Amino acid sequence: SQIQFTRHASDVLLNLNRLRSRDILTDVVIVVSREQFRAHKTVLMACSGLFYSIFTDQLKRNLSVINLDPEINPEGFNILLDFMYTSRLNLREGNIMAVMATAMYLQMEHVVDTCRKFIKAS
């Protein structure tokens, strides 16, 4: 059997995030009513069922700008975008409802599950 590098996935992830913070190869701008977020489409698709369906759409595949539902709050989206790239979720009793609703919309099932844990713990 293959040697298994248990640290490889999170090294790739950390470099993807360094790519993003230096804006290298980012190929999409996510629009949330007024606010803008630069990302890599494959990372978005690897993290969210919604992005998977969007960029798997023959029509929408080649857009450089994607509008999401403009009722999404942008803070909740921002928290979720940093999570995608860092595996770290900034959850608090001050944002929990916003972040959870945005994760449901984005179809990020692990995050919605942990949000249910957090509600039940506090």
Ligand X SMILES: O=C(O)C[C@H](C(=O)O)N1C(=O)/C(=C2/C(=O)Nc3ccc(Br)cc32)SC1=S
Bridge partners of 66, per DSSP, are 30
Which range in 9-17, 30-38, 66-74 contacts a second copy by CB under 8 A?
9-17
Which of positions 2-21 make contact with ligand Z88 (CB under 6 A)? 3-5
Instruction: State yes or no: residue 36 binds a second copy (CB under 8 A).
Output: no
Q: Which residues of 72-81 are buried (b: 16+ CB within 10 A; e: fewer)?
A: bbbebbbbbb
Number of residues counted as binding ligand Z88 (CB under 6 A): 8
Instruction: State yes or no: residue 94 binds ligand Z88 (CB under 6 A).
Output: no
